[PDB]
């Protein structure tokens, strides 16, 4: 099923569901809690992403190394996707802060954003963590919109923002867990999977709309 994805084999990668076959979380997740989401929370996540997407799309986000971010021709709202979600949640249940080797599905390559935050004993929302992904737009350059760069320094500086605002992406599915890390602080771990996967080396992030010459 998930072990016959040419997507993985091509990438010499073991799929997350193919490897971790258990729904119960891994030994990294000491004294764990708050697996997954309420439906209230799932809308929270989708709504934040669309808010941000719409902002950039409408030519309103004004930050960036080379000046403000231009509006988009098409920028579809993301809809929640339970397949991606359960694959995100499985990798989330392993409590190892990094991307998994592969998380793809029959329909498309799947992208990914990761966040974790700490507290003595935790009051941190995913919305907080998403805003922090998006805040990478402070380091973003206009010139990377029409064709995504190959450079990895860049992928790292701005990759989470670019995935959020990826026009072609239309589906999101996230997973989350909380657990005691070895120093007793409470860690709050969010992984979001996106479909189809953004940050395609060469593709445009979105189609740059132009403001009309005859709208005065």
Curated annotation (Swiss-Prot):
Keyword Signal carried by entry: yes
Disulphide-bonded residues: 3-18, 8-102, 29-95, 174-192
Domain called SCP: residue spans: 46-194
Tissue: Expressed by the venom gland.
Name of the protein described by the UniProt record: Venom allergen 3
Protein family (similarity comment): Belongs to the CRISP family.
Presence of the UniProt keyword Disulfide bond in the record: yes
Region of interest: Disordered: 57-76
Annotated GO CC locations: extracellular region
Subcellular location: Secreted
Main location: secreted
SMART domains: SCP
InterPro entries xrefs: Allrgn_V5/Tpx1_CS, CAP_dom, CAP_sf, CRISP-related, P14a_insect, V5_allergen-like
Protein keywords: Allergen, Disulfide bond, Secreted, Signal
């Amino acid at each position: 099923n998930y072990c016959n994805l040419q997507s993985c084999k091509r990438n010499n990668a073991i799929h997350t569901m193919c490897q971790y076959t258990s729904p119960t979380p891994g030994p990294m997740c000491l004294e764990y809690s708050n697996v997954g989401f309420t439906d209230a929370e799932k809308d929270a996540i989708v709504n934040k992403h669309n808010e941000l997407r719409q902002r950039v799309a409408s030519g309103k986000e004004m930050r960036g190394t080379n000046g403000p971010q231009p509006p988009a021709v098409k920028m579809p709202n993301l809809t929640w996707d339970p397949e991606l979600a359960t694959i995100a949640q499985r990798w989330a249940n392993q409590c190892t802060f990094e991307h998994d080797a592969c998380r793809n599905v029959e329909r498309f390559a799947v992208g990914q954003n990761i966040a974790a935050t700490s507290s003595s004993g935790n009051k941190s929302t995913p919305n907080e963590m998403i805003l922090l992904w998006y805040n990478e737009v402070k380091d973003f350059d206009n010139r990377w919109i029409s064709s995504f760069p190959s450079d990895d320094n860049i992928l790292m500086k701005v990759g989470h923002y670019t995935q959020i605002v990826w026009a072609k992406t239309t589906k999101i599915g996230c997973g989350r867990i909380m657990f005691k890390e070895p120093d007793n602080w409470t860690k709050h771990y969010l992984v979001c999977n996106y479909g189809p996967a953004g940050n395609v080396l060469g593709a445009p992030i979105y189609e740059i709309k132009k403001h009309h010459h005859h709208h005065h």
